[PDB]
Amino acid sequence: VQLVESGGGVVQPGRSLRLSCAASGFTFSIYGMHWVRQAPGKGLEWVAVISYDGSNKYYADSVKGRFTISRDNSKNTLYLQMNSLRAEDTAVYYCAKEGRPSDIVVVVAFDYWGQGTLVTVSSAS
Amino acid sequence: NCTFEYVSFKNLREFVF
Amino acid sequence: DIQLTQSPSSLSASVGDRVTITCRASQSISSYLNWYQQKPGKAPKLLIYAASSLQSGVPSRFSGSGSGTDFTLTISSLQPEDFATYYCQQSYSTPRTFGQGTKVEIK
Amino acid sequence: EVFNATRFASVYAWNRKRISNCVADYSVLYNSASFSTFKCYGVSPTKLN
Numbered sequence: 001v002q003l004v005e006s007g008g009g010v011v012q013p014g015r016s017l018r019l020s021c022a023a024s025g026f027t028f029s030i031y032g033m034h035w036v037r038q039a040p041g042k043g044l045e046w047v048a049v050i051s052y053d054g055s056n057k058y059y060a061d062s063v064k065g066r067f068t069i070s071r072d073n074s075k076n077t078l079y080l081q082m083n084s085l086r087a088e089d090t091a092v093y094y095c096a097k098e099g100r101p102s103d104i105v106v107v108v109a110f111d112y113w114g115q116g117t118l119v120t121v122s123s124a125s
Numbered sequence: 126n127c128t129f130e131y132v133s134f135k136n137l138r139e140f141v142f
Numbered sequence: 143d144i145q146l147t148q149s150p151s152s153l154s155a156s157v158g159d160r161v162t163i164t165c166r167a168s169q170s171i172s173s174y175l176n177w178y179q180q181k182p183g184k185a186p187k188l189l190i191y192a193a194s195s196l197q198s199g200v201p202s203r204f205s206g207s208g209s210g211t212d213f214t215l216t217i218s219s220l221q222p223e224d225f226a227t228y229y230c231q232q233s234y235s236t237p238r239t240f241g242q243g244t245k246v247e248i249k
Numbered sequence: 250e251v252f253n254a255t256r257f258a259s260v261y262a263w264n265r266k267r268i269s270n271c272v273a274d275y276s277v278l279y280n281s282a283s284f285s286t287f288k289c290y291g292v293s294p295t296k297l298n
């Protein structure tokens with residue numbers, strides 16, 4: 001099971017960016033997918049979640065309206081469309097998979113993480 | 126070593142226990 | 143939103159000690175914490191799910207317990223590699239949230 | 250009555266109260282949510298009633 005993240009880099013405030021997480025090693029199309037971000041030196045902050053089929057999408061408080069999560073079950077790739085970027089959005093963003101370890105499936109849990117990608121919202125050159 | 130509890134010639138009384 | 147607060151925010155201890163980290167929820171979620179171990183510069187690793195089940199490959203010294211609102215993560219005997227930041231995380235309802243983090247350092 | 254007793258005893262002297270010959274509404278306990286932890290190991294609280 002592998003989650004390859006990409007799409008990071010330097011973005012000026014107010015522009016947009018798309019993050020990608022390529023899924024392999026498991027049946028992607030049956031699992032929910034999460035985005036989790038970590039501001040530099042800060043704690044974890046849940047970002048967005050998408051249902052297996054992409055019909056259901058929920059977002060955290062700080063990103064409603066600006067962030068759009070999407071899904072491609074054919075390429076087994078997860079995308080996070082971020083818009084109206086601002087200074088506070090600078091964070092190392094993780095894609096993550098639902099997962100449940102045993103039979104306590106009434107736990108629906110959290111599991112294996114991608115390596116994480118850094119997004120810097122800055123006007124610096 | 127103790128358990129639950131319950132509370133609640135002219136004549137002949139007959140009891141079958 | 144369901145708020146999860148960890149205490150203490152940090153603690154110093156030595157190898158072999160017994161440590162206790164508590165996460166308390168604003169509302170009863172009744173079995174839905176998940177405990178992770180995070181090291182600086184790398185993604186977190188899941189430790190305990192349903193607040194009491196040990197995830198495969200994690201040493202048996204890690205233990206979680208509780209239900210409802212009061213929960214505990216316990217490591218029976220510390221080793222050098224266990225000094226790290228630990229987050230609780232609820233899954234009862236959306237939006238999913240995390241605790242603020244508990245850092246374990248060397249005394 | 251057990252939960253709403255004005256004073257509970259100290260932890261060392263744990264009072265043991267025996268219950269019998271009554272119908273028990275576990276569900277009313279289950280629905281009540283003031284109790285911070287309603288942990289169950291032996292039997293699932295739904296089946297308790």
Ligand SMILES: *[C@@H]1O[C@H](CO)[C@@H](O)[C@H](O)[C@H]1NC(C)=O
Pocket residue numbers: 126
């Ligand atoms: C109470 O019952 C137990 C049963 O194992 C017995 O060992 C004990 O002696 C009893 N107490 C008295 C005072 O006989």
